[PDB]
Structure formats: C-alpha cells, structure tokens
Design a protein around this ligand. Structure first.
Ligand code: NI
Ligand code: NI
Lengths: 312, 310
C-alpha cells in the first residue's frame, strides 16, 4: 500500500544522498574540501526530512516489515562504505584545514541518524525489533568509528611506507624502453631494420620483467596509490597534514615546555621552504607556474600559521 | 581604419584562445584543439570578406597600424611554438594528420590575408608589411611542414627527471617520518620531534642545493614528474603511431614478417601486464586504469593489423 511506500521512498533518497557523498569523497584528491562538507550537510538535511514524514506514519504489519528488511540493510552497508571512504581520505582534508568541520558534520549525522532509528522502532512491530535494533547499532557504531577517528587521533598514525618505489622503477624502465626506440624509428629512413627489431625485443623483455616484479606486490590504497599517479600533490598534502598535526600538538608541547625549541625549528623549516620554492619557481614552464605558486604559497602560509601559534 | 583593426584584434584573440587550449592539452581527446583551429581559420577568412572593400590607407594611418600587426604576429608565432611543443601526445592520440591539415589551411588563409593587405597599405611601407607576412608564413610552415611525415624532430630521450624525483621522494620520506612520530606522541620529552624536524629541514636544504645547477623543465618534459603514468602512456601511443607510419618502407626493405611477430609479442606482453595491473588498482582508479590499458591494447591491435603479412 501507499502507507509503506513513503518510508521506503525516504530510505531510497537517503541512500542516494549517501552514494553521492561517497562519490564526492572518491573524487576528492585534496585542495578545497567545502564541497564534501556541503554534501554532508545535504545528506543530514535529507535524513532530517525523514523524521518529519515518518512521525505520522502508522504501525507496520508483520508481513510488511519483512519487505522492509532488505532496503534498510542495503542502505546501512552503503553508509558504512561511505564512512570508510571518508576515513581513507582523512589526511588531505585535515591538511587543508577541514578536520573540525568534518568532525562536526559526522556528529550531526550520527545525531540525526540515531533519532531516525529511535523513531523507526515504534513504527515497526515488536517482534522484529531485535533485528532493527541490531541494524541501528551497526549504523551508529560505524558512524562513531569515523567520527572518533577524525576527532582525537588516538592511534591514528598513518603508516609511513612505500613499495611505491618499485612500481615507479618499473614505470621508469618502461619509459626508457619506449624512448629508446621511439627515437630509433623516428630516425630510421630505410635499409636493414634489425636494430628496430632488437629495440622492440628489448622493450618486450622490459615489460615482461615489470610484470614479473609486480606479481607478488600488494594492492595499492587510493591515498597511497596517488603517490605514483599524483606524485607532487600527495607530497603537498602530506606536508600540510603534518603541519596541522604539529599545530594540534602545540598545547601539550608548550605544557612539556619545548615551545622555544619548536618555534626556532619551525622558523628554520619556513626559511628552507622559502629557499626551495624560489629555486622551483625558476625551473617551471610557461604553463605550470601558476599551480606551482599555488602549492608553494599554500605551504608557506601553512607554515606561517603554525609559527604564529608556537612562537613564545 | 577601425574595422580592420577590430578584425586584427579578433584574430589575435582567437590565436590566444588556441594557445590556451594547446597549453591545457595534456593529451587524450584532441578534438577541441582541432575545433579551435577551425574557428581561428574561419575568423581569419572573415577578415578577407570585410577588408576587401576597404579604401587605401594614408601614410600616417599605416604607422599606427604597425604596432598591432606586430603584436598579432608574435602571438601567432608563440601559439605555433606551443603547438609544436605538444606534438607527441596529439600524434599518439591519432590527431596528427588533422592538425597538419588545419595548419596548412591556416597558412593558406593567412597568406591570402597578407596578399590582400599589401594593396590596402601605401607602397612605401610595403617593405615592412611583406617582411611581417614572411615572419608569419615561415613560422606556420615550421610547424606545418613542422608537423607531418617526421624524421627531423626526434624528441631526445632525457631523464634528469630522476634527480627531481629523488629530491621529492626524500622530502616525502622526511615528512612522513615526522608526521608519524608527532601522531604517536602524547607528551614528555619532545627532543625526538625536534630532531626529526631538523632532519627534515636538512633534507629540504639538500634538495634545494641539488636542483641549483639543474636546468629548466619543458612543459611536456615536465608533465613526467607530475603525471608519470600519463606521460608514459602518451609516449607509448606516439611510438606506436610512429611505427605504424614507418611500415611502408620497412615493408619496402622487407622486414615485415619480423616486425609483425615483434608487434604480436608486444601486444601479448601488454595483455599480461594490464591484467596484473587490474589486480593492483583500488576503488576509484580502476576505471582510468582500464581507460589507458584498453587504449594501449587497441592501439597495438591497429598497428598489428597494418603490418601483418606485409
Ligand atoms: Ni571500500
Ligand atoms: Ni613559449
């Protein structure tokens, strides 16, 4: 009947929102993270809009509830996935400056979601309540796991690691192989073509070697995988994040009384950055100057804030 | 006088747009560039239609119209240069004949325009005008003949891009080293953190020192450190294209069978690799990985078809 097909609709909408959020998260390599926040807000709003429309709905039938089991489960899993994705892209957002906002958003979501769950209990019949409660728990707990991880940073240390060194090496080799003959032919006009053939063979061999190499190597995590695809960006993000972390742990380093030591170090770092960024600005092209500035400036400015925080 | 000036301005704008487009183009779909070129050509043509009926300029009028023409020409030259610089990726994509055609068309139109303009200017300023025209046309040719058939501009293999890589990697290591310790630390002695910071600073300094005497980096040369995955792909495609092009005279020399087998082997290798790669990709990147890999495999296939039994 139509009485059931409104809650269902709401659920679907929520799921869609969640999916959108997930997509956004996936997209976000770094930089401006307003969009993600906006998405989160939208999702929250959508969730809220459920409460307003589900409040006056009647008590469901025994057989009606079981049709509604699948939709909920589907939603919950999706939500969990989204949360996981968000967690995965913790660092860059943090670096950008967007950790408090995100934390807030998650909390808000939890608060809304919890409310929704509470509401839904009284609409379902009382013998399905065990399932429903469990489902709710699965959601809320999951949400918390994100929220908790984005808010205290207790055991949150991002494991420094890179067997990205060997993938990179392989890539380099491949490039060399290509450029090795990609000249040879380009040069070639006629006569014996033995050389070209040899080059091709060599390239093939190289490729084979590369394949062999990446046989036992593990998968690549998306934030970790952007190291090799997006090499400089990752570095930038990880610098920013580091800076943010440092800023965060000012209070209890001032408490331990290292503050002066810290400040000097920060200053030194800033100086180094200035030195490097100047040199860099010399080595860039027509086209890529603007972006180069954009990163460097961000870095320098990021440093500055930290310095301000920890000076004296 | 106004109308001609306006036309010139429009042309300049078009050229600028084209240049911008070229700059943007990392590779992939290159339709847009072609479209831009076409538009530019059209614009140029539209000059002829509006400048034909214009009267003969005065002695004093011509000299005001010297500085704008010059500005235009330089811009055009720059655009051409930029286009040339982004030769390889376009070629790889498959867009080399079209581009060549476009350039030729532009030259033809531009030439016509130049011819037209001679008769509107007075005859004692013709020495300058002709020179200006020549500057353009020659420049255009440099890319146009610049752009088809090959065997002259062979991008030299160059990989000082190593040192930069090393530097960046080092920096990353330094950062990720601190950014772990900091994360860990709750309080107490903070010496360690300070030490880490110092180390990082030192590393940075070293990096700076390193890239002191190293040269500039050319845009396409430079997109190898920022988009390594993509540069490799493009260079591969380009290479394949080149190979395809030089089938005729390798069939003429009669290596064709040898070539074909080699191609097949290469294809096989690609297939092998691309499968493995498909295992190591994540949530989000799979799609792109497919997109490149598929392109590569398909690219190979065409070449194979071309050179099989020939
Ligand atoms: Ni996942
Ligand atoms: Ni230039």
């Amino acid at each position: 009947q139509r009485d059931v097909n409104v809650f269902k609709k709401v659920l679907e909408n929520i799921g869609n929102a969640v999916t959108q959020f997930n997509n956004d998260i996936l997209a976000y390599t770094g930089g401006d993270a307003n969009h993600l926040i906006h998405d989160g807000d939208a999702i929250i709003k959508a969730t809220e809009n459920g409460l307003q429309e589900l409040g006056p709905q009647p008590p469901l039938s025994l057989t009606e509830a079981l049709a509604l089991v699948g939709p909920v489960q589907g939603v919950n899993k999706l939500i969990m996935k989204t949360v996981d994705h968000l967690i995965e892209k913790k660092g860059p957002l943090v670096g950008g400056g967007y950790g408090p906002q995100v934390k807030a958003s998650l909390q808000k979501q939890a608060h809304a979601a919890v409310t929704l769950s509470e509401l839904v209990s009284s609409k379902v019949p009382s013998p399905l309540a065990p399932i429903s409660k469990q489902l709710s728990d699965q959601v809320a707990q999951a949400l918390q796991k994100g929220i908790e991880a984005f808010s205290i940073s207790a055991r949150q240390a991002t494991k420094v690691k890179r067997d990205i060194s060997a993938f990179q090496k392989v890539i380099q080799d491949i490039s060399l192989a290509v450029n090795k003959f990609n000249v040879d032919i380009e040069r070639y006009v006629g006569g014996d073509a033995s050389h070209l053939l040899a080059d091709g063979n060599v390239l093939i061999k190289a490729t084979l070697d590369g394949v062999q190499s990446l046989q036992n190597e593990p998968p690549l995590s998306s934030m970790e995988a952007l190291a090799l695809v997006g090499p400089v960006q990752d570095l930038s993000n990880q610098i920013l994040l580091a800076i943010q972390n440092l800023i965060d742990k000012k209070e209890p380093l001032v408490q331990a009384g290292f503050g002066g030591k810290v400040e000097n170090n920060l200053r030194q770092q800033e100086e180094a950055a200035q030195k490097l960024s100047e040199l860099v600005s010399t080595k860039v092209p027509h086209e890529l100057a603007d972006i180069s500035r954009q990163l460097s400036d961000g870095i320098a400015a990021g440093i500055k804030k930290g310095i301000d925080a920890f000076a004296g």
